[PDB]
Each structure stands twice: as structure tokens, then as C-alpha cells.
Symmetry: C3
Subunit: 149 residues, 3 copies
């Protein structure tokens, strides 16, 4: 019994792992995930940057980061409104970095942005035009998470 | 060996349980669930109240119940059309109670409602503009389920 | 006690099987599955027929097949654009068969179709008004999968 039941449960476990992978694939498909493309998702809720980060972290994803013009448009279409991007200059003013680490490679700043306006702006939002504007991390904008291709 | 294999499998099971909970979270998020708010969802199918209760129960949820104006609006946006709410006055006429227990607190009745029209109306539907109208439990309306915050 | 841990493991696994089944039911419900009806899903991606077949098969479904007018309307709403159906006359020119086996019965051909136009057309797309047109399997149309009732 013992060894047999143990061997059976290993098979039951592997079977459940396969089924759950399948469920995840179907869910990504249903949410618009395109072959070989990373995918962005939103619950359409607007909140402070720190809350977006914590929320995407729970889902094992990251705050949406467009690495090129295609991903930038993709994020725009998903959000439908202003949304925080996974980019800030919180560590060194004027120097924007990805929350996943590293200096910017692609950017689509609105004219004369980023400007750290008034009391200060260390976060970034993609606006209803695809362009970027640095804004207060305390302001509430749409939460858009990103998952791997 | 045996004790080690069993321990390693108990660890795989724990990881799998966490992954499934993550799948449930991502799904709810993708379907619009707001932080600290109940999750309302519909398949857009109209059916009698008895069936809506059976369906939500099978999904381990319950028929949608608006506890306040905010939830009422959230349910309205999800339903899109007339939908049953988890409220009835089957016990004492005029005394509406939640299907999960307790007396009705918040309400958003339409002018001249509830009227227990004709042979009687002991169920409730959220209709145009989010107002409420009591209706026969045998009539078919949209099935909207709620899941905890 | 080895046997006590094994019995708990069995209970943990069964609880997980039940919870995954509920997650799948809730997802299908959230995607619009009507009671006792098969349901359709699309990621809105356009690709050649062989890829759509591969994708749906990997998700344990099949390329969508309208068996009647209701299902045809349901597929049309989901697709929003031209989409391949699980119907072809690849095996014997002129005789359309379901990819899962059997001769085509219900059909919704546009006037003057199917016509195996030019070098040939062995696949089928649901297009404008939900009518059908036979087209080259190499063309790229929206991927729509169907899952059992
Ligand atoms: C007044 O502040 C706002 O407008 C300026 C430009 O006018 C932006 O730079 C800033 O981030 C705010 O959105
Ligand atoms: C005729 O019955 C219907 O219309 C009245 C108001 O006109 C409602 O109160 C009732 O529930 C039914 O919807
Ligand atoms: C030119 O070919 C296109 O148009 C004809 C009818 O005009 C269809 O039958 C065919 O599949 C193509 O869509
Ligand atoms: Ca600063
Ligand atoms: Ca700054
Ligand atoms: Ca700015
Ligand atoms: Ca009554
Ligand atoms: Ca009544
Ligand atoms: Ca009434
Ligand atoms: Ca042929
Ligand atoms: Ca011809
Ligand atoms: Ca043909
Ligand atoms: Ca044709
Ligand atoms: Cl800031
Ligand atoms: Cl009634
Ligand atoms: Cl062909």
C-alpha cells in the first residue's frame, strides 16, 4: 500500500500541475494574451503608485512597462485612461529607472516632460494619447499589471 | 526515503495551493474586482430566481446583494440589464430579507414599488438606473453572483 | 505516523481537485458560458487555420463550430470579426466536415458560397452578418475556440 499510494499521489500531483497550467493558459487567452507577446491587465481601479506596485506584486506581475512603441500602444488600449507605468526617479531626482531595475531604454515623454512639477513628481503615467507625463506617486491612476510573453 | 518523499510532496501541494489562489486572484482582478470590494460577475443569462440561487451556490458564491449605493452601482454596471438580487419577502409580506440572512438595510426602490403586483411578487430585480422593482420569483432575469472582498 | 500523513495528503489533493474544478466553472461563467451550452472564447488574435487548431487543441477545446443559428450568433458576438470555424473540405474537395468528424449539416453560407475560389479554398470563416465564406486555410483570421457544454 504505502509505496503504491505514494507513487499514485505523485502522479495525482503532476496531473493537477498540468491542469492548473492549462487553466492559466486558457485564462490568459480569454484575457487577450497574444502569442509571444507579454500581456497587460487591469481591473480599471485607480489608486496611488505604491498600491499598484503591491497589487501587481501579489499577482506575481509587475507595474506595466512599455519597452517600445508597440507595447506602449498595447498598454494605452488596456488602460483607456491615465495609468501608472513601472518607472520612477524616486532614487535620484531627474534619473528615471524601471521598477524592475535599470535606466530607461525607451521613452515617449510629452513635450517638456518630465518636469518634477511643483511640490514634486517622481512617478510616470501614460496619458490618453500614449505620451508620458511624470506625476505625483500619491495621485490615483489606473492600475495596469504586466505578465511575461 | 519514504518520509523524505512524503515531505517533498507536502511541499509541492502547498506550492500548488498557493498557485491556485494566485489564479483566482488574477482572474478576479481581470474581471474587474476592486481592492477591498466584493466581486460581482455575470454570464449574462436570464433565468428564474431558483436557478440563479442554485448557480451562484454551485460557484460557492451567492446572488448579488447591494449593501449600499456604491455596491448597487457596481452591480448595475455588471448586469447591464434587469437582474435578480439576493432579497425576498417570502416569509412576511413587505419584510424583505437577504437570502443570506438578516433584514434589508439599504434599498433603492422605484416609485410605487414594491407593490407585490398581481398574484404576488416576492423577489427583487435591479432595473433601469439601478432602481429596484419587486417581481415574481418565477420570472427570468439576469444571473449575477457575488464573491467576498 | 506515515499513514496519517498519507491520508491527509489524499484529502489535500481531493480538496485541490474540487477547488480547481470550481475555478474552472467560475471562469467559464465569467466568460459567458450559458447553462448547458458550450462556450466560446477568443484572444482576438488573427492567424492561419493550422495555428488556430493547434491553439484550441492545446487548451483542450476545438476551433469553434456553429451547430445551429443560436451558436452561430454566439460565435459572431465573441469574434467581432472574420473568424475560422472548425469546418473544412480538406479531405475531399466539396465535402465539408467538422474537424472533430462528420459531414456538415447546419450551414449559413453567403449567397454563391462555398466556391473553392481560384487555386482553392478549404477552410471556412464566419464573416459579415454571421454568414459563411470558404477561404484559404493559409489566410489569417480570428482565433475562436469552443469548449463543451
Ligand atoms: C500643473 O501640473 C500639471 O500640468 C503640468 C503641465 O502643465 C504637468 O507637467 C504636471 O505633471 C501636471 O500634470
Ligand atoms: C404590470 O406588472 C409589471 O409592471 C408593474 C409596473 O408597471 C410592476 O410593478 C410589476 O412588477 C411588473 O413589472
Ligand atoms: C476574390 O475572392 C474573394 O471573394 C470571393 C467572392 O467575391 C470569395 O468567394 C472568396 O473566398 C474571397 O473572399
Ligand atoms: Ca524627487
Ligand atoms: Ca521627479
Ligand atoms: Ca509632469
Ligand atoms: Ca408575499
Ligand atoms: Ca411581496
Ligand atoms: Ca413590482
Ligand atoms: Ca481542395
Ligand atoms: Ca470558380
Ligand atoms: Ca474547398
Ligand atoms: Ca469563397
Ligand atoms: Cl512623487
Ligand atoms: Cl414571487
Ligand atoms: Cl485552402
Amino acid at each position: 500500500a504505502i509505496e503504491v499510494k505514494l507513487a499514485n499521489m505523485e502522479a495525482e500531483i503532476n496531473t493537477l500541475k498540468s491542469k492548473l497550467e492549462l487553466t492559466n493558459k486558457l485564462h490568459a487567452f480569454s484575457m487577450g494574451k497574444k502569442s509571444g507577446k507579454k500581456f497587460f491587465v487591469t481591473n480599471h481601479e485607480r489608486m496611488p503608485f505604491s498600491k499598484v506596485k503591491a497589487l501587481c506584486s501579489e499577482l506575481r506581475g509587475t507595474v506595466a512597462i512599455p519597452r517600445n512603441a508597440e507595447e506602449n500602444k498595447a498598454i494605452q488600449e488596456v488602460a483607456k485612461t491615465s495609468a501608472f507605468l513601472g518607472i520612477t526617479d524616486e532614487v535620484t531626482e531627474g534619473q528615471f529607472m524601471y521598477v524592475t531595475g535599470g535606466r530607461l531604454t525607451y521613452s515617449n515623454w510629452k513635450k517638456d516632460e518630465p518636469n518634477d512639477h511643483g511640490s514634486g513628481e517622481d512617478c510616470v503615467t501614460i496619458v490618453d494619447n500614449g505620451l508620458w507625463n511624470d506625476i505625483s506617486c500619491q495621485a490615483s491612476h489606473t492600475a495596469v499589471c504586466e505578465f511575461p510573453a
